[PDB]
Structures are given as C-alpha cells and as structure tokens.
C-alpha cells in the first residue's frame, strides 16, 4: 500500500494532522487503486496530501457535530471525492475538492475562511508550472476581495488527477447582500474578465424564461489554466424537480437542439438512479424535501469558445433516492446497459470503503450527486462522494 509505505517513512504528525492523514490517505489511495492509477501517481497524490492538505484541515472530527457549516457537503465534511466515468473501457478519473481552514476562520482577519485556499493554490502554482493564476486573481478580487447571507463557505479548491498530470479548479461562492445577488456579482465579474454570447444566453434564460426564472445562481467555478482554455461554470439551484423541468434546463429552453436521444437516455438514468417508477410522468415532481441543497442543480459552462452554453445536470441522490446501494446499482445498470461498466465493482468497493459501517443499504449520504452531461448522443456521468466525517462519526 502506497499510504502504508509513506506512513511508515514520513515524519509523524501531531494528533489532528495525523488523524486527517490516516483517514484521507487510505481513502484517496483506495480510490486511485480502484481506478487503476499508476503507482507513481498514487505516490504523488499522497505526498501532495501530506504536505499541503493535511496540515490545513483544522481539528480532527471528534463528534457528530461539525466545527463549521461548510458548504462542501450536507453534513459539512470539508472533503468531497468524485469518480468520473469515461466511455470506451477507459479508467475513471478521480478528483477531490477540499475546503482548507485555519484558526482565523470567522475572525475579522478571515471572516469567510478564504486564506488557506489561496495559500494552497499558490503552493500548487509554485510546484506545477502549467497552472495560470490570472483569472483566479481576477475572480478572487471581484468576488471575495476588499470590495465584495452566506452559504457557509465562499471558496474551495479541487484537485483533478488526470492520469498523467494534475489540474486545479477553484469554486467561488459569493456572499449575497440585499442589493447584490450572487448572480449579479458573477455576471459583473465575468463581464470584467475580458472574454460573451454564451453568458448573455444564460442571462436571458435566467431572466425571461418561465423555467429559467426558477433557478438561483450560487457558484462560479474556473480552471487554473490560461484564460482562453479555462471553463466558466455557473451553478444554479431550483426548487423544481420534475424531469420536464430538468430536461428544459438541459436544453436551455430549446437553445440547444440535437439532444433528443441523449435526453431519452437521461430520463432512463434519472428514474433508474432515483428509484422512481418506470412509468413516472415527466411532469410529476419528486416528493418534497426541504433542505439548503435540495431541488435540481445545474451548471452552465459559459466559456467564450462555446457560442452556445453547455449544461450539466446533477441528480441529487442523497435527497431523493432510497439508499446508496440502490442508487449505485441503478447507475451501474444504466452504465452496463451502454457498455460503460468496466469499473462497476471498483466503484462499489470505493463506496464500501467510504460508507459508514453498515449503512449503504439503509441510508443515503455516501453519494451526493450523479452529474450528467449530454455529449452528442451519449451521457457523461460523474459520481460525487461524501466521506461523512460527522454524519457518521466512527
């Protein structure tokens, strides 16, 4: 085991950092091993984890009560893994998002817990040269800086191990005021970035469409590459849960055509993963669940390369499915029905590793979202996983 070797030989850490190491290391190593990553990449992932992530995770979990209301996960776990399924018998891609913390979180020196994420990004930039911080600095400055109701967090980072190299993504969650909505801030920032037809399409949809007006933008994500190559993803939530609504948002009210076959496949997967009745009418709503993160969630890639924006829909399994085992088996049934299930048992072993002792069959929580994108006639799927350090304190 790569983690066992590194733990045998790296210098021992203090109580909190060591707990985080002996918890996150085995988890990330297990996921990468089930995704068949090369040994060297496993070593790199865990050495990054040991030097830059573990020291900045804060105090170790000690109760079912989290020391923050972090927006990363519903139980406020500050880590979220994700397992992207790749077509054509290829290996899955492993990514993990982290919200680092410091004893200054909440003080007037860092009231929204932003400095550790900044430092992490700068450290990575110093080590990996391919990272570009021009747009990070722009959007940080416009959304979190000295000018700038809270979702519990305002920034976090994501490491994508792309089999060969590492990419970084940054998420800004604007703080809203009665006069400046999150969407207001994100639109003004993007318009200042120096790109804009796709943004205008999203603005028209959100402002004047009957189903677009039910979306509330809340997050912006960028990649730390050259700004011409970076994606601009705007995340939007709605109280609506009918698949008729999800389909219309996927089509942006019809701006996107040539999506009929993939949306049929999407309806199949939606009912399969959520455990719905196969004859469920697309007009029907999911049974109501009141929660800060309930409802349908979507992202709109509004990057200048695109002309028309692209949409990714997130099936919220933690809120509308019956249990993680049912949801995972439904997703895997869809994937294997389309020849994309070479790593189904690897995914299940990862789930069992992440799952609270004996709860895959009884509860939701491990899988947070199944993200769906319509690539031509097929689907692109991503499973988002929550380690549940507090909902399931071991």
- State which residue, 118 or 312, has the beta carbon closest to ligand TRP: 312
Contacts of residue 84, Cβ cutoff 8 Å, sequence gap at least 6: 92, 93, 94, 95, 380, 381, 382, 383
Which residue's beta carbon is nearest to the bound ligand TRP? 293
320 is in an annotated binding site: no
By the rule CB under 6 A, 73 interacts with ligand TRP: yes
334 is in an annotated binding site: no
Q: Tokens 């309806």 correspond to what residue?
A: 267
Least CB distance to ligand TRP at residue 368 (A)? 6
- State which residue, 105 or 221, has the beta carbon closest to ligand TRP: 221
By the rule CB under 6 A, 314 interacts with ligand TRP: yes
- State which residue, 91 or 216, has the beta carbon closest to ligand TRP: 216
250 is in an annotated binding site: no
By the rule CB under 6 A, 298 interacts with ligand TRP: no
Q: How many residues does the chain have?
A: 394
Contact 88, 55 (CB under 8 A): no
Least CB distance to ligand TRP at residue 235 (A)? 6
Least CB distance to ligand TRP at residue 2 (A)? 26
Q: Identify the residue among 41, 75, 80, 203 touching ligand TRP (CB under 6 A).
A: 80
The whole-angstrom distance between residue 3's C-alpha and the CA centroid of its chain comes to 25
Q: Identify the residue among 96, 135, 172, 235 touching ligand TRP (CB under 6 A).
A: 235
Binding range to ligand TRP, per CB under 6 A, among 71-79, 87-95, 137-145, 201-209 = 71-79
Least CB distance to ligand TRP at residue 229 (A)? 22
By the rule CB under 6 A, 389 interacts with ligand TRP: no
Contact 370, 304 (CB under 8 A): no
By the rule CB under 6 A, 370 interacts with ligand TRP: no
Binding range to ligand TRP, per CB under 6 A, among 72-80, 175-183, 185-193, 252-260 = 72-80
80 is in an annotated binding site: yes
By the rule CB under 6 A, 71 interacts with ligand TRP: yes
By the rule CB under 6 A, 294 interacts with ligand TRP: no
235 is in an annotated binding site: yes
By the rule CB under 6 A, 183 interacts with ligand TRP: no
Least CB distance to ligand TRP at residue 70 (A)? 9
By the rule CB under 6 A, 81 interacts with ligand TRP: no
By the rule CB under 6 A, 369 interacts with ligand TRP: yes
By the rule CB under 6 A, 293 interacts with ligand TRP: yes
- State which residue, 52 or 71, has the beta carbon closest to ligand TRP: 71
Label the pairing between strands 232-238 and 378-385. Answer: unpaired
- State which residue, 2 or 144, has the beta carbon closest to ligand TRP: 144
Binding range to ligand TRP, per CB under 6 A, among 12-20, 37-45, 68-76, 343-351 = 68-76
Q: Return residues touching ligand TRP (CB under 6 A).
A: 71-73, 80, 235, 293, 297, 314, 369, 384
């Amino acid at each position: 085991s790569v983690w066992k070797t590194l733990n045998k030989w790296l210098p021992p850490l203090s109580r909190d950092k060591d707990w985080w190491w002996k918890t996150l290391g085995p988890q990330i190593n297990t996921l990468l091993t089930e995704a068949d990553y090369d040994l060297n990449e496993r070593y790199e992932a865990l050495l990054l984890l040991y030097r830059w992530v573990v020291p900045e995770m804060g105090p170790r979990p000690r109760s079912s009560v989290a020391p923050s209301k972090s927006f990363m996960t519903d139980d406020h776990s500050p880590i979220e893994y994700s397992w992207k399924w790749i077509s054509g018998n290829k290996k899955p891609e492993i990514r993990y998002a982290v919200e680092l913390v410091s004893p200054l979180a909440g003080s007037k020196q860092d009231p929204f817990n932003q400095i550790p994420t900044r430092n992490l990004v700068y450290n990575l930039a110093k080590i990996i040269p391919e990272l570009d911080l021009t747009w990070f600095e722009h959007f940080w400055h416009e959304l979190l800086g000295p000018g700038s109701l809270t979702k519990g967090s305002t920034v976090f980072a994501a490491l994508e191990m792309l089999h060969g190299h590492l990419s970084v993504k940054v998420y800004f969650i604007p703080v809203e005021t009665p006069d400046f909505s999150a969407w207001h801030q994100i639109k003004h920032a993007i318009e200042a970035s120096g790109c804009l037809e796709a943004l205008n399409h999203v603005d028209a949809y959100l402002s004047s469409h009957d189903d677009g007006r039910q979306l509330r933008p809340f997050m912006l994500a960028i990649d730390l590459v050259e700004p011409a190559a970076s994606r601009l993803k705007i995340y939007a939530r709605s109280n609506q849960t009918s698949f008729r609504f999800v389909r219309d948002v996927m089509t942006i009210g019809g701006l996107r055509t040539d999506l009929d076959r993939s949306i049929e496949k999407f309806s199949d997967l939606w009912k399969r993963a959520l455990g719905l009745d196969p004859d469920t009418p697309p007009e029907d709503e999911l049974p109501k669940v009141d929660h800060l993160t309930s409802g349908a969630v979507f992202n709109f890639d509004v990057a200048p390369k695109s002309q028309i924006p692209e949409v990714k829909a997130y099936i919220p399994v933690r809120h509308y499915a019956n249990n993680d085992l049912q949801a995972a088996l439904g997703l895997i049934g869809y994937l294997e029905d389309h020849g994309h299930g070479g790593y189904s048992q690897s995914y299940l072993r990862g789930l069992d590793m992440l799952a609270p002792s004996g709860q895959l069959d009884q509860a939701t929580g491990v899988q947070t979202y199944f993200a769906v994108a319509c690539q031509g006639e097929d689907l692109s799927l991503t499973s988002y996983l929550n380690p549940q350090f507090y909902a399931a304190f071991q």
